[PDB]
Design a protein around this ligand. Sequence first.
Ligand SMILES: Nc1ncnc2c1ncn2[C@@H]1O[C@H](COP(=O)(O)OP(=O)(O)OP(=O)(O)O)[C@@H](O)[C@H]1O
Ligand SMILES: Nc1ncnc2c1ncn2[C@@H]1O[C@H](COP(=O)(O)OP(=O)(O)OP(=O)(O)O)[C@@H](O)[C@H]1O
Lengths: 214, 215, 240, 240
Amino acid sequence: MTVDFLSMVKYTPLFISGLIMTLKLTFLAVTIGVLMGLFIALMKMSSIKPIKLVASSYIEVIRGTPLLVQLLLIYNGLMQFGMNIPAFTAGVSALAINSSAYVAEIIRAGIQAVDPGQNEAARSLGMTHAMAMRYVIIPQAIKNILPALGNEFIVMLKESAIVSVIGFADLTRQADIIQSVTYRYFEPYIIIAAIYFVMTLTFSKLLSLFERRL
Amino acid sequence: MTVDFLSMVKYTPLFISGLIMTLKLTFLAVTIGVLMGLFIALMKMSSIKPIKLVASSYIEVIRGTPLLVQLLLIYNGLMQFGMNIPAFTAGVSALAINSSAYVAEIIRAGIQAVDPGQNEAARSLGMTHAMAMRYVIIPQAIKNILPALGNEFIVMLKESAIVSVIGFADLTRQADIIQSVTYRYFEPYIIIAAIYFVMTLTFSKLLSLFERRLR
Amino acid sequence: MIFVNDVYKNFGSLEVLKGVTLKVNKGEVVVIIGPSGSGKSTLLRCINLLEEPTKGEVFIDGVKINNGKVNINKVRQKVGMVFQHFNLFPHLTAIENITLAPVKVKKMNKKEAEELAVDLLAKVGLLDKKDQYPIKLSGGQKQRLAIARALAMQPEVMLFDEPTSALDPEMVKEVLNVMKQLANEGMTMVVVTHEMGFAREVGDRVIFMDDGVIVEEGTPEEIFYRAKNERTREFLSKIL
Amino acid sequence: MIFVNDVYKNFGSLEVLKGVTLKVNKGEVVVIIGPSGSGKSTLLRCINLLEEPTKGEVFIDGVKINNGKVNINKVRQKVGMVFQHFNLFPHLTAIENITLAPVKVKKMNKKEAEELAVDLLAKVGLLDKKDQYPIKLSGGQKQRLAIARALAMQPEVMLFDEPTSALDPEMVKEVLNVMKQLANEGMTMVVVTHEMGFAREVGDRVIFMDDGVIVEEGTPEEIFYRAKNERTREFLSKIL
Ligand SMILES: Nc1ncnc2c1ncn2[C@@H]1O[C@H](COP(=O)(O)OP(=O)(O)OP(=O)(O)O)[C@@H](O)[C@H]1O
Ligand SMILES: Nc1ncnc2c1ncn2[C@@H]1O[C@H](COP(=O)(O)OP(=O)(O)OP(=O)(O)O)[C@@H](O)[C@H]1O
């Protein structure tokens, strides 16, 4: 028809449900993506030439490849093997995976970021690569990484709206659900977009405010 | 059943067609997005408080908001007004718009990037903000900006696989199309993903190569 | 000529200039010295309005230039500035650096501006380098070239913000020599420097700043041999 | 003790050391000088293998350390290094900076290391600053703290790679003094510096490098007052 937002008010429980779904999806996908990513990083630092090459290729592949295709590849691609994984787990796996590569590059970058001088001071005082890393470099690379991570999570939120297409009851899916009973697409989107926005701002507020502390 | 890529071979014309569509979509969306972003930038440089405030809010919103929701908002959201825009034009618009914000921020950053010393030398030589800008500052920001743009396009390529869900015949959509006649999803995806990879590598390589030529 | 009248300056909570007065008349070579953070380069920079005083006023040639009712570009046409870091234009060649402002600000004739530049280049001993780009120049070649550029807009005063501080030691003489030559030619100079040799050799007046204030001032030999104030002595003691 | 034997070094196409030999024995204070790019800090950094010679060998205490068949972590225990840019550890306190390596490399007693640090802090006059972080420290304070830290591992030789050049001039005396004091106490020192006063006052031997080579070397007074080589005199005229 023509615009009516006031009619949209009754559907709040849906949106709130959608949001809580987007949160629960991302919080878990990042959490996994992180732990996965720390692991992939360590592989690229390994002296063993094979392991570093795999982690290098793994990282190079995921980053150079669409999240969507990674989503569909797990969900649709895995069916013909008698696999029926829920939309939820597909999205988490897809995200924790896309997540993992970028987390593995943030780690590496936060280390290379600490001044090469710090290392030289440490080695030149007799400390071994091990010790230098533990007591000097790492404690300092951490302050490099946490900002880029929290900022990744913030990105993963926008990201996660794509698993809507797999029929997951996330914030983006609620527009389909709503319009089915209202024939309205516009208003439920503007609302959802506005919700994504406020989520972005807020985390960005807390992300930069936590950053100014370090 | 079990993995069989060899059966996928006959579908080459489809993939080749999917790619050429991915290319046509991204290329146009960027071409517009850039010019669009360039315009948004100038607005954020306006002395005029209203114009600067809108371009800032525009940029703030598009970046802090999902591409998907932007796609759907254009496609699905516009139906109820008697609007039926093709998937193609919808995907382009969504990209050119999402693109435009990151372009307006790439530009501003490429300018802020050139040493504040340069403006000072020029201003201290009698040159006005205008002159300083034309003859000294901008020529140097360009070498900052072209790299970040070309790097944006590469991102616009991965991005564009999303217009498949809107039923656009892009490279990702080819996996649905194929499976309708094969009941295979896995192989056609691994293929499409492999194509996306190779497109990435190729462009990233030429992007870095063009960087060393400027800097 | 130049008259900085009791200016103050903040950068946020940071009080850098805490009430400073500076008069310099035509022909003077006035050298400003002091510990880091004293306010030296900020004072030096209020002169051509590269900084805006939180308070106080600066008059050059009798006219207040920080009232916002005056064309600031036509002010900097008269007031030259040499930079600690050279701040050359990297995309332009040696000549191109020099001729840019005159051709575009003064609207000089390109042929005339081209002949001016080759003169200045010879003056600062860089003629053989006229076409090369700022990056093939030594730090010493750089600063001398920067000086040529500043002069080509023919100022009545030249501001020097530590023109030797980012130079390898074997490179400081040549830049200091050029500066001295100008002093000898009667150019009005305000100079902020660590090089007390310069003040000794061609300075007319020496200003000692400390903690955002001018704590003492006089002639080179006054300050360097007979400094009255304890902070002056203390500072000089560490550096001479 | 130290024996850098005919080493060469490249950085890509860049030839920095073009065959250099340097022997230094217990007690000598050897100061290396020269123009930018002469090879000075690269030589100094081959000593404890902070650089690996493209060719040639370095022995410390008679044993080759760049044959890949030696524990370099046990080498840098003997050869100390003070850096131009201080390289203190930000997240650690003054004492924490000093006490770290001894505790973790030597496995020292924490109460013992505290007194070593407090001795050293006191020695270099940073006692009131023991629990400050390497931030509330002036650049001069920083380098003295760095020096205490190196000393706490009690090396037999100290490498000084331009310990003063990133210091405001009011800050150079105090650090140079600590250096003099160490020399006076008999510490073996190789020092790369721009401060010829130090070379004069405490140098036992002075090496003049130019273009990746030792072009001339002799005592402070031989080099500063009776230099035989033309390139030696030319360099010295620009700096002195
Ligand atoms: N562009 C700027 N914005 C804010 N603060 C500045 C700026 N430039 C310098 N400062 C600060 O002003 C203070 C005074 O420094 P300034 O360089 O003006 O005087 P100085 O220390 O005597 O000179 P120098 O540092 O050149 O020896 C310092 O604390 C410095 O950090
Ligand atoms: N790729 C490189 N890596 C490290 N050092 C290099 C490289 N290329 C050139 N160098 C220079 O080789 C120099 C040999 O020292 P030298 O004293 O001659 O140079 P300098 O520019 O005066 O610097 P400094 O006086 O700080 O040593 C080193 O100081 C260093 O700056």
